[PDB]
Design a binder for this molecule. Structure first.
Ligand code: 3DS
Ligand code: 3DS
Ligand code: CL
Ligand code: CL
Ligand code: CL
Ligand code: CL
Ligand code: CL
Ligand code: CL
Ligand code: CL
Ligand code: CL
Ligand code: CL
Ligand code: CL
Ligand code: CL
Ligand code: CL
Lengths: 135, 136, 136, 137, 138, 135, 142, 139, 135, 142, 135, 138
């Protein structure tokens, strides 16, 4: 059981909460070890690169945890790539997106995702991992 | 550590999709809480006033709240205002993916004042919310 | 067959053209009897009470003639409960909601109802009964 | 006492789709019910908007009630609303299917605000229930 | 000089629904006013959209001025607007009642953007003032 | 007898069609004389001055022909003043206000005016005068 | 000799500790004390009641309608949401005054609409708990 | 193999204002010659009457024949026409001569598009012939 | 001590309830005397004049009772001027603005005002005076 | 004549991606079909696909410099990209927009295009044939 | 080479950053002299007065730098007068008008202006002068 | 020296093929103008959103000012707005044409609310005036 953890634009800028992307990678590694699954963490500011990673996960029938960053609210292309996924897709936001600007309260990904976790910080990733471990 | 799980209108009607009843949900939440070293108090009411009362009590006791308000999520400013008193973390839960249904379900009065929102992860949404609170 | 006639908020205030709810209850009961039906007519200003009456009608698989009053335009919770009904559900308004304020022109119940009767006075209940006598 | 039943565009096409009742059979159902109630029913169908307006003009002059199913014209025609505004005798709008359980544009009616009452989603029986109201009022 | 006065749905029913000037009286008064101004008015009424479309085609084909009261079709008919867009001679839109002191859906018109001008709420005299404009126009 | 023709902002700028405001006043007065009416034509860019003129017409119970210019689409204050008028009120626009921007297609004046003339040029005033002579 | 009903909706029993920067530090019991004193000063009798239940509020409005007694209403969250409450208040023959403690227009946009305002005699917003007292003074004058 | 080509309001007035020199009489002939070349037969008709258009569509539904439809202004306004067209089981292709999206916003909504097989817009009168070719390639 | 009562466009036309603006000035001055305050009541149809008065109140740190009339729904200039006020600002409307047309249900002044009194007739002013006497 | 057929994001996934919506024909097969139709029409067709907005912009730029007509299916970018529209506005030779699925029978957000207003023509919902029909249009006025 | 700087409602209130209107007029005239231009800076809280100043600039064919204050978002009349201008028109806002309330993000003046400078403080005026010097 | 980043988004490499000045001519033009003000301008262009995000990140880490013309991404990219939100040094948004005299969708900007200021419609000089603002704000 391999879970794909895909981070979109600006997410490599974490810390620089105060948890850096390197620290998040480490946290996911340990949680994956506890849950008895493999987790691959990827980050790109490139929409095309994210599309390719979804495509691979579609063909490999592997679960995806996706934090699309700003592309969440804007990209039909990313939504359409995600629609190919037969394994579960969990949308993740670190901050509570409904406490911010109104334009952030709409998502192209949410309707086609299995579930969404919002505002639970970095823990949102680990909780999504646990959902997939027990499903 | 005491955690309140509060279920709103129609949630007592669980599995009467899907299969899991409210009693079975209560038992799962209590079992997971015990493993995490927490105590969970699970309540359900179709009455807005009763929900408001439980929120007020949680505000006075500064206890965390896992809230599934059902249909009141999209309609009740009064429930939002009650939840605004809470000093301890508030997590909003929905069993179904609220964004894969009607457009009126894609707005929540509770979300902006909640700490976090878990949607569409089924009944396990409650248990993941419990684990978050045990880790904070 | 048992037919449930459920009236929402402010409907116990009928009269003060001048038919009271007590007169309405009796008129519905007599009309249903002539059609070979039993009419159970109940009114409440409490949403929680209305939800409970819907739950029972869902479990007993009984037809519901519903006039939710103001809750027609506001309650997602009542819609979700009515969504459970397997037997026909008929929405009734005494006045013509389309000839009044614009907010009365939306109903949360209509999309999940079997049918809707509007503006035909108290006889709207009687015509709803006659539909149920035929179907199905 | 005579009551006018007026059907708009596409309503002559009743049967092929879905209930499974034809317009001829609907005419027979309404007439049988009207006589029983002590009323006379004139049931007419046209795809032409100009023909519906003329039938409504005559109904207004004769001060006769109108049971109207305008079809798609319910949502689009201001002229039809203006004609129905002349009616001094009661007007009951009828839809066969539940108009609110379909597309959103069907959920608005130009006729509803000026009608006495509206019956929606009760199938063919909606016409008969409309007649019974008129026998009372 | 011919001026086309075209009345749409429900306007044959003038003298009811709202004061009590019939359409025949409207035809008679427009023709009297047209004669005084040195014009010939062709006044016609129909509840049929196709007929109104045809009359407008004729007025475009003959390059003749149009005074148009479309009734309910004012707020609804794109077809009528497209037909009117073909007109090279002036077009005046007329409403007898004040359309802005009524329902909000009446405050939009498909014809107004493509007309020369619009007269609203001046009663039956709106037609007569539209004729007078066309006596100097162009 | 007495008819007030009130012009709002930028209407003194006519010419630089081609007809200037001085010539318009002359046209209106000549047309009013032929109909057996006296026309008082006044122009101001000041909202306060327009309200004052409308207040006087309300007190004197005299008909008003009003071209409020830009204030047509923006001024509730002007609308409220015109509401006091008992004698008829004719709203006039020189250009076809519906063949331009969408914000010009709303008028605060229209719902409370007896009638509206639009797009009939300078002659809009004259036809408005002719309506009042018959009423 | 003249009765004025003061009706408080959801969450108003929580006055004192609930969002103090928005509603103040005065307790509901102290509010009851302040209103009753001011009413007697004006020659009126004030009956002050609070409920989190919509049904209970509807009932109090009905009774006020039958008795033809004035109502001072702070519906709380139900201001922006309840058509049922609006419909009940429409029965009132005696004046209805809508009261908000906080300035409802200086906050979220959804608070800037009220189902109650169009059918009330008048509305007092953002003048604190004194809004109640000023509403009493209007009724004593009318 | 009969294909119905139905033109709505104002389409009888083709080539009177101007782009656009081909008349409706000549368009009818172009469609028929192209249809014959593709081994099909086109029945091209035009009416300003909605009732007449509805009648032609009813017949097409009962005969189970494909429809190529340019409804003119009724595209954006007629629910009745939509409802009649929904009865069609054979392919329905919406056609517009000009680019409907390069004009007024209200022309960017079609009641017909959702219930049609496909839509051809802005390719001139050749839109008709390309719609014919779609049908010929799916015989 | 010094409370400013400022009335906008058309409010000099009160009476033409039958309470005149002269009577309103008298009532306010009477009520201010009972509460131990001095009330300076002023009316103008000119937006510019009202802005000037707001500026003066801002510089003097004096409370304002404001009925802007039609400018309530239309004037951002007046909103920005009133934003300068450090002393309390009470918005007043004589009629119930929410029982009328929909455009009246929006106020540019409400969000920056201390409070709003609507639909309590002429007494709204006197109740607003009483609030200020308590602060 | 040289015609450019450009496919946007996810269009390289044809055959596998939601087949009940887009069909079972792969992108490689689409390339072969277009080349077969082009040869019959006496044209030369260059078919290219990219998931990258930048690469698509570059192909549009080149087509503008060479004044070659473009058949474009932008995929998801259709409803989102102003940048693509601004590139396409630079084309002097015709631009035909193609959608495989009937975009108006689906979600409402798909019923708007940034590309449609600046395009010459638009073909929607005729499947893979849409591309071939666009080819013939360009051939008949080349 | 004459440039007209026209300041609208509330702009005389600058200071009470901390740059006053007098200081602004001083800074504009310094920059005008260095660029070989003549700057006429004028302020009014009166809409009618602003309309008059742009009428003069229209007649003289002189460029305008306009900061209309709250009238930016509300005045069609001001837009209509500015439409007459043959010479360039630059719209200026001192603050970032897009970082505030939503109603401020719409301008009636922007569409008819040559250019718009926003959020660059007092220097927005001086940078507008420098544009007009090269045009 | 005092470094100023000038970042151009999609389609801006295509300048001069409505206008006349090419992008290369613009780069050289900005550089010389910056030097005269005692600044050093680094002018960069990309049609790739990922590349613009990269350049914005580096500007945030170095705390250097940014003059940004994001092209079509102005109206569409939340990602770019979020990256620009990290900037502590001033940010100036630039549009060559008057974005308010064109289509309605161009009148909304995701970047404007988070920018220090916005210069629109002043042609190629908009870049130069932006540099001059930064010269006074060091
Ligand atoms: O006392 C008040 O002003 C309020 C109380 C409430 O509970 C809120 O729902 C209302 O929007 C404001
Ligand atoms: O080929 C098509 O019609 C489509 C392809 C896509 O990738 C979708 O984003 C688009 O909405 C429809
Ligand atoms: Cl969506
Ligand atoms: Cl919210
Ligand atoms: Cl709904
Ligand atoms: Cl309506
Ligand atoms: Cl239009
Ligand atoms: Cl209005
Ligand atoms: Cl309301
Ligand atoms: Cl549709
Ligand atoms: Cl506001
Ligand atoms: Cl567009
Ligand atoms: Cl604008
Ligand atoms: Cl924004």
């Amino acid at each position: 059981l391999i879970v794909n953890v895909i981070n979109g634009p600006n997410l490599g800028r974490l810390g620089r909460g105060g948890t850096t992307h390197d620290e998040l990678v480490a946290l996911i590694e340990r949680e994956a070890a506890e849950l008895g699954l493999k987790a691959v963490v990827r980050q790109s500011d490139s929409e095309a690169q994210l599309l390719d990673w979804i495509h691979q996960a579609a063909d490999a029938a592997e679960p995806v945890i996706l934090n699309a960053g700003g592309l969440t609210h804007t990209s039909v292309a990313l939504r359409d790539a995600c629609a190919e996924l037969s394994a579960p897709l969990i949308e993740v936001h670190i901050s509570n997106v409904h406490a911010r600007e109104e334009f952030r309260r709409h998502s192209y990904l949410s309707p086609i995702a299995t579930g969404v976790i919002v505002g639970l910080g970095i823990q949102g990733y680990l909780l999504a991992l646990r959902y997939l471990a027990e499903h």
